[PDB]
Amino acid sequence: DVAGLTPCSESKAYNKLERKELKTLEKRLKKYEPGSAPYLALQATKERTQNRFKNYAKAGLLCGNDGLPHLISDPGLALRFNHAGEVFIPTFGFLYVAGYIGHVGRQYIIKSKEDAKPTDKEIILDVPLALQLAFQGWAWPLAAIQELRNGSLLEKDENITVSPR
Amino acid sequence: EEFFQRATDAVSRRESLNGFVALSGIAAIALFGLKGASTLELPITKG
Amino acid sequence: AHVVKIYDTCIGCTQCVRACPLDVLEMVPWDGCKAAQMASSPRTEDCVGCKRCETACPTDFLSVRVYLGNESTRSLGLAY
Amino acid sequence: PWKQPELDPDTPSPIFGGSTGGLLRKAQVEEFYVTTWESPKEQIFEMPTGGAAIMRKGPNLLKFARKEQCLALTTQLRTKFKMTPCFYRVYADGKVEYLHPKDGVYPEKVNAGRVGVNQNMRSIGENVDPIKVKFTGSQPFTI
Amino acid sequence: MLETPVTSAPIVANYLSNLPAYRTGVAPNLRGVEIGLAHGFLLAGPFIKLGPLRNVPGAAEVVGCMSAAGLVLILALCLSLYGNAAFQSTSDPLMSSEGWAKFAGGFTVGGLSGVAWAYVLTQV
Amino acid sequence: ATKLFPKFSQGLAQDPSTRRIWYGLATAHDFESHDGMTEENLYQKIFASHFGQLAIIFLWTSGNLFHVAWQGNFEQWVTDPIHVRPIAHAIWDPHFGQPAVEAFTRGGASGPVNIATSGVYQWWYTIGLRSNQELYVSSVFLALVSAVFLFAGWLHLQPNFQPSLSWFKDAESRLNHHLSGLFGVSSLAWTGHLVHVAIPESRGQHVGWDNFLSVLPHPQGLTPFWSGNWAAYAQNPDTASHAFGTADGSGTAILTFLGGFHPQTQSLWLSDMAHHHLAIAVLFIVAGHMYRTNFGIGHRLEAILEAHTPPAGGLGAGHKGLFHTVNNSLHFQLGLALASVGTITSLVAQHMYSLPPYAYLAVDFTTQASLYTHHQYIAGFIMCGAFAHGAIFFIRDYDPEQNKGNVLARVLDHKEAIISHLSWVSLFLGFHTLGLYVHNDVVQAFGTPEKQILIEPVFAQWIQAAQGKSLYGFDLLLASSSSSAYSAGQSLWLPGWLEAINNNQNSLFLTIGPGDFLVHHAIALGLHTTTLILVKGALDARGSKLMPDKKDFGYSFPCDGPGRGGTCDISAYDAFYLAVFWMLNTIGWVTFYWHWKHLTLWQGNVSQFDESSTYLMGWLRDYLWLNSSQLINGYNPFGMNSLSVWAWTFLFGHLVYATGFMFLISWRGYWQELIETLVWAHEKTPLANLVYWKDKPVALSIVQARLVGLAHFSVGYIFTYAAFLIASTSGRFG
Amino acid sequence: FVPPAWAPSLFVPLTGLVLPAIGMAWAFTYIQKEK
C-alpha cells in the first residue's frame, strides 16, 4: 500500500483491463470455427493473457488508479515490502552480465595488444581465444577488484595521451 | 523638345527629389486612413 | 589578407608548395633541417586560405599555418 | 630568371571558340591574369574556365580572371606535357607584374637567392596566450 | 566571349540600340521620361486588374492608379538611392552622378505622366 | 574598399563584398576585437550600452502600460477578473477583412484587439493599480525614467565624466552597494509600497498620491515597530471569505506568514508578500556591509580567495589567483552572471505556476502557460550564453601562469575525465529512457498495456510527503503530528501550507506518476547532454588533440580545412550552436510536459495524462494531435474563428523552421557557384548590366551559415510552440 | 492623455511604411559611403 498504490490482486482497474482484453480476444475468437489454426492461435493468446494477468498478481505488484502495475524503486523500501526483485535484483543481474562483457573485452584487448599488428587481431577475431575468455569470465568481479588492488586495472596518467591545455 | 526638359528642372537635384518624394509619401500615408480609408468601405474602420 | 606562418619544425619536403593552388609558398635555403630547405610565404596576399598546404604537411601538428581574416578580392577567390 | 621575360600581347591565342567562364567585368576594372607558354607541337588541352582548347605550335597566350586558374593551367601543362609556362598580372592601368617563376626556377626549388619571410623561429605551440597580447593589435602568431 | 545568334543578331542589336537606355545621344531626362512613361503605363494594369477593390466599380481604377503611382514613387526613391550610393565618387553622362539624378527626376515625372495617361485612357 | 560602415574594424572596411555588411552587423558589439581601442574605452562603452539596454527595457514596459491603458479593458477586468479576457493592444491592419475584424472584436471592444497573455493585468491588479489614469501616469513616468537613463548613457560617456578603469574594478564597493542599495533598500521601498497601497487596495481602500500621507497603513501606527511589538502587525489577517476588490471579510494586517493561497483568488497573500520583501530587504542590507570599502572594516575578496585553499593538497593551490582572473576577464563575470540569472529565471518559472503571486492568475490558464514557456526558454538561452561566454573567457583572457595549480588549472587538467563522465551519464540516460519509452510504446501497441515498465517516482513522492502531501501515505515530516517539523510552527504556516498542498486543483506539488518520472528523467538527460556539449566546447576551447592552437584562432572560426581527416565545427562557437539545438529540445520537452500535465489538470482528466504520458504515441496523439484541432481550424474554407492568427503564426513557425533547415543542411560551395553563375548572368545581359553592385555578392560564411540557420531554427521553434500553446489553451478555456 | 480615434489610423502607417523606408535609405547610404 506504499506510494498510495493498491496491490494488483485487490485492485479494481486491473480487473477492468483484464476483462477488456479477454473481451476483445473473445470477440476476435468468435469469428473463426473452433477446429481452425487461427482459433488455436487466439486461444493460446487468451491463455497467455490470463496467465500473465495471474502471474502479475500474487507477486507483490502494485498499481495506481489505472490497473497498470508500478515498480517500487528505492531499495530498503523494496526490501521491506517484498519488491526487491522488481528493480533491485534485475540491476544486480544486469551489472553481473555487463561486467562479464566488459571484463571479457578488456581481457581480449590486453591479450591481443601483445602480438605484432594488434589491429589485425582486432578486425579478424581469434575465435578460440574469444571463446576461452568467454568461458573464463564467470568470476569477473573478483578478478576486476584484484587488478584494482594490484594496480594493473588503472594506467598512470604519465603514460596516457593528454590533450593540450 | 521643350517639354520634358524643364519639367524635372526643379526636381533633378538629389536633395530636391528626395525631399519631394519624402513629402509626397508622408502626405499620401497620412491621408491614408482618416481620409484614404473610410471612403472606399475599407474593412478596418467599420467594426 | 590571410596570415601564413611557417615554424622551424619544417623539414623542407616541399609538399606545401606543391599543394598550393595559388603559388604562395616557396623554398629558401636553411640550416635547421637535413634537407637544408625552409618554407616561406612571400606572396601571402594571394592566399585564399584553402589550407591545402596544411594537408600536405607531414610533420606532427603543422609546420605551416593559415589564419583567416581581412578578406579581399584575391582572398575571397572572386573572378568578378 | 636570368632575365625576366616581358608580356607580349601580340602572341597568338590557342584555338578555341567562345568562352563563358572567361573574363568578367573585373578584367576591365581590376587586375586580370595572362598565362603564356611555348608549345613545341599542336596539341589539345583542357582549360580551367570551360571545355577544351587546342594550343598552337609556338607562343600561346591565354587570359583568366583569377590567379588560381592560371596556376591550375600551369600545373596541368607541367604535369601533362612538362611545358613550364608563366603568367603575368595586368592591372587596369596596364601595369604588368611577374608572378609565378620569381627566380625563374619554380618555387619547388631553392636557387639560394630567395629570402625567407613570414617565418617564426619558434616551434608551433610555443606562441603566447591571447591574454598576453590584448588591446595591442598583434596576434600571437604574428610575433 | 561566347557569341550567339541571339546576342549578335542585327535585328536584336537594332532593337536594343533605339531603346532609351542604349540611345546614342539623348539627354538623360528624356530617357527617364520615356522609361517612366512606359513602365508606369505597364505597371498600372495589374494594379487595376486584381487589386483589393477589383469588384467595386469605379473604385478599382482609381485605387489601382494611386497604387501604381505610389510604387512609381518608391521606384524613384530607390533609383535616387542607387545613384547616391554608386556614383558618389568620380564617358557616358547617364552613369554620372547628376546625370543619374536627372534620370531619376525624369523617371518619376514620366511615371506620374504614365499613371495619369492610364487613368484617362481607362476612363474613356 | 575602406568603407565607412565598419568604423570599428579597418579590416572589415576593406572588404569588397556583401559579407562586410553581415560581419559589420554581427561584430557590432564585440568591442574587444575592435581595432585601436583600450580597456578603459571598452568599459565606458559597456557602461553606455548598459544604460541603453536599461532605457530600452523601461521604454518597453512603459509601452506595455500605455497600450494597456489605451485600447484596453483594465477597468472592466478589474470589475470582473474571471469572465472578460484581458486586452493587449488594438489591431489596425489595412490588409484585414470584414470577417477578420468581426472575429477579432473580443472583450467588449470597439475594434480588433489582441487577448493579453503576458499577465500584466493580474500583476497590476495585485500591486494596486485600478484605473487607466494610473497606468497612463505610470507609462509617462517610465518614459521619463528611460529619458534620464538616456541622459546617463550620454553623460557618463562624455569626456571629463568617463569613469576610470579601476572604478569599474572596485569589486568590493560595487558588491556592497548593489547588495545594500540595488537589492536591499529597493526591496524595502517595494514592501513599503505594498503595505501602503496594495494591501489597502486589496482591502477596498483607495490609496493614491492625492490621499497619501493621510491614510495609516496599520491602526497601531508605527509604535509596534519602535517598541519591538512586531506581532501587532500579524494580528488581524484577512479571512478566507474575503473579496479582493472590496472590504468584505477584511482585516488589519500588513505583515504576516499566512501560508498557502488566498481562497477567493488562488494567489499568495499580499501581507505575506510584503513580509517576504521586508525580510529580504533587511537581510540584503545586513549582507551589504561585508566587503572592504574605503572605511577600516570589511572583507577583501582577494584575501578570502587566497585563504580558502584546502590543506593536504585537496584542491592544489586552491582558489588563489582567482580574484585577478574574475576582475580582468569580463567574460568570466558575464558567464557567472548569465548562469545565475538563468538559474533564477528557471526558479521563477518553476515557482510561479505552483505558487501564483498575482490575483486571478491561476484561473488564467493561457497566461500561466505563456509565462512559464517564456521564462523557461529565456533561461535556457541565457544558460547557453553563460557557457558560451565561459568558453570565450577560456579562449581570450586566461593566463595559466597567473592561476597556476588552482581550481581552474585543475579542471583544465582533468577536463577529459569530466567530459567522459558527462558523456557516460548522457549516454546512459538517453539509452535507457528511449529503451523504456520504446518498450512502453510497443507494449501498448500489442493491446496489453500492463507489460509496460512503470517505475513509481518514490523519491520525489517521499519528498512531497515530507513537505505535507498526505496522498502518497508515509509517516514523514509535515504529515504526522508527532514529527518535530510539524510541531515547530504548527500555528504559523502549516494550517495554510497543508491546505494548499493537499488540494489537487492548484498546481502546488501536483500528483506525479510513472510518466512524470520518465519525463523528468528525460529532462535530466537533456540537461546533462546540453551540459556535456557546452563543457566540451568550453574546456577544449583553447586547445585539443585535433587542434592544439585553438586559442590562436579565436572563438568563432569555421574550420581548419579537410586536412587531418576533417575539422569542421571544431570551435567552441560551433559547440554552442549545437547546444542551442539541444537546449531547444530540452525546453521543448519541459514545456510539453508542463503543457500536457496542466491541460489534463484543467480539464479534470488527470488520469488521461497518467495513463497516456507513459508511451510516446500518447504524447503524439493525446497532446500534439488532440489539442491541435482548434489551432488548425483558426481559418479554413468553412470560415474563421478567433484563432486564425495562431494558425497563421503556427504555419509561419513551421516555415521558418524549414528555412533554418535550408541554411543548415547546405554549407557554402553550391551557393558560391550559384552566385558566380548569377553574377555572369547579370553581367552578360542587356538592359540590366547598366546598374551594377558596389559590393560583390558572395555566399554567406560557414560561421554565418550556422548563425543564420540557428536563428531561423530558434525563431520557428519559438513561434510554432507559442502558437500551439496559446491556441490550445485559449480555444477551450478563458 | 488619451490619443484620438484616428491615432491607430495614422501612426501605424508611418512606422510600417515610411519609417522603415527612411531607415533603409539612411542605412543604404551608410553602407556604400566612401570616406
Ligand code: CLA
Ligand atoms: C505595416 C506596414 C504596412 C502597411 C501599413 C500596409 C498597408 C497596405 N498594404 Mg501592405 N504590405 C506590407 C506592409 C504594409 N502594408 C508588407 C510588409 C508586404 C509584403 C509582405 C505587403 C504587401 C501588400 C500587398 C501585396 C498589397 C498590400 C496592400 C496594402 C493596402 C491594403 C488595402 C488598402 O487599404 O488599399 C488602399 C489602396 C489605396 C490606393 C489607398 C492609398 C494607399 C496607397 C496604396 C499608398 C500610396 C501609394 C504610393 C505612395 C504612390 C502614390 C503617389 C501619389 C498618388 C500620392 C494598404 C495601403 C494592397 C494594396 O495596396 O493594393 C495594391 C495589396 O495588394 N500590401
Ligand code: CLA
Ligand atoms: C531525436 C534525435 C536525436 C537523437 C536520438 C540523438 C542521440 C544522440 N546524440 Mg544527438 N543531436 C540531434 C538529434 C538527436 N541525437 C540533433 C538534431 C542535434 C543538433 C545538431 C544533436 C546534437 C548532438 C551533440 C552536439 C551531441 C549529441 C549526442 C548524442 C548522444 C546523446 C547520448 C544519449 O542520449 O544516449 C544515446 C541515446 C540514443 C537514443 C542514441 C540512439 C541509440 C538507439 C538506442 C539505437 C541503438 C541501435 C539499436 C539497437 C538498433 C540497431 C540496428 C540499427 C543500427 C539498424 C546520442 C548518440 C552527444 C554524444 O555524442 O553523446 C556522447 C553530443 O555530444 N547530439
Ligand code: CLA
Ligand atoms: C532489458 C534490460 C536492459 C538493457 C537492454 C540495458 C541496456 C543498456 N544498459 Mg542498462 N540497466 C538495466 C537494464 C537494461 N539495460 C537495469 C535493470 C539496470 C539496473 C537498475 C541497469 C543499469 C545500467 C547501468 C548502471 C549502466 C547501464 C548501461 C547500459 C548500456 C550499455 C551497456 C554496455 O556498455 O555493455 C555492457 C557493459 C560493458 C561493455 C562495460 C561494463 C560497464 C558496466 C556498466 C560496469 C559494471 C560494473 C560496475 C563496476 C558496477 C557499478 C556501476 C556504476 C554505474 C555504479 C545499454 C544501452 C551503461 C550505459 O548506458 O553506459 C553509458 C551503464 O553504465 N545499465
Ligand code: CLA
Ligand atoms: C568491451 C570493450 C569496452 C570496454 C571495457 C569499454 C569501457 C568503457 N567505455 Mg567504451 N565503447 C566500446 C567498448 C568498450 N568500452 C565500443 C566498442 C564502443 C563503440 C560503440 C564504445 C563507445 C564508448 C562511448 C561513446 C563511451 C564509452 C564509455 C566507456 C566507459 C563507461 C562504461 C560503459 O559501459 O560505457 C558504455 C559503453 C558502451 C555503450 C559501448 C558498448 C559497445 C558494444 C555494445 C560493446 C562491445 C563489446 C565488445 C565487442 C566485446 C569484445 C569481446 C571480445 C572477446 C570479442 C568505460 C571506460 C563512456 C565513457 O567515456 O565513460 C567514462 C562513453 O562516453 N565507450
Ligand code: CLA
Ligand atoms: C548579458 C548579456 C550579454 C552580453 C553583454 C553579451 C555580449 C557579447 N557577446 Mg554574448 N551571448 C548572450 C548574452 C550576452 N552577450 C546570450 C544570451 C547568448 C546566447 C544566445 C550569447 C552568445 C554569444 C556568442 C556565441 C558570442 C557572443 C559574443 C558576444 C560579443 C559580441 C556582441 C556584439 O557587439 O555584437 C552584436 C551582435 C549582434 C548584433 C548579433 C545579434 C543577432 C541576433 C541573434 C538576431 C536576433 C534574432 C532574430 C533574427 C530577431 C528577429 C526575430 C524575428 C521573429 C523578427 C559581446 C562581448 C560573440 C563574441 O564574444 O565574439 C567572439 C560570440 O561569438 N555571445
Ligand code: CLA
Ligand atoms: C547603492 C548604490 C547603487 C545602486 C542603487 C546602483 C544601481 C545600479 N547600478 Mg551600480 N554601482 C554602484 C552603486 C549603485 N548602483 C557603485 C558604488 C559602483 C562602483 C563601484 C557601481 C558600479 C556599477 C557598474 C559598473 C554598473 C552598475 C549598474 C547598475 C544597475 C544594475 C542593473 C539594474 O538596474 O538592476 C536590475 C536588477 C535588479 C533591480 C535586481 C536583480 C534581479 C534579481 C533576480 C531579483 C529580482 C527581483 C524580483 C524577483 C523581480 C521583480 C521584477 C518583476 C516583478 C517584473 C543599477 C541601476 C550597471 C548599469 O550601468 O546598469 C545596467 C553597470 O554596468 N553599477
Ligand code: CLA
Ligand atoms: C510534415 C511533417 C511535419 C514536420 C516536419 C513539422 C515540423 C515541426 N512541427 Mg509540426 N505538425 C505537423 C507536421 C509537421 N510539423 C502536423 C501534421 C501536425 C498536426 C496538425 C503538427 C503539429 C505540431 C505541434 C502541435 C507542434 C509541432 C511542432 C513542430 C516543430 C518541431 C520542433 C522540434 O524539433 O521538436 C523536437 C521534438 C520534441 C521537443 C519532442 C517530440 C514530440 C514527442 C513525441 C513528445 C514527447 C517527448 C517527451 C518529453 C519524452 C521524450 C523523451 C526522449 C528521451 C524519448 C517543427 C516546426 C512543435 C513546435 O512548434 O515546437 C515545439 C509543436 O508544438 N507540430
Ligand SMILES: CC1=C(/C=C/C(C)=C/C=C/C(C)=C/C=C/C=C(C)/C=C/C=C(C)/C=C/C2=C(C)CCCC2(C)C)C(C)(C)CCC1
Ligand atoms: C564554462 C565556464 C564557466 C561557466 C560555468 C557555468 C555556466 C556554470 C553553471 C553552473 C550552475 C548552473 C550551477 C548550479 C548549481 C546549483 C546548486 C549547487 C544548488 C544547490 C542547492 C542546494 C544545496 C539546496 C538545498 C536545499 C535547500 C536550501 C532547500 C530544500 C532542501 C535542500 C537541502 C535540497 C565560467 C563562466 C565560470 C568560466 C569558466 C568555465
Ligand code: SF4
Ligand atoms: S609541407 Fe610542412 S614540412 Fe613540408 S616544406 Fe611545407 S611547411 Fe615544411
Ligand code: SF4
Ligand atoms: S591556404 Fe592554400 S593558398 Fe594559402 S598558403 Fe596554404 S595552400 Fe597556399
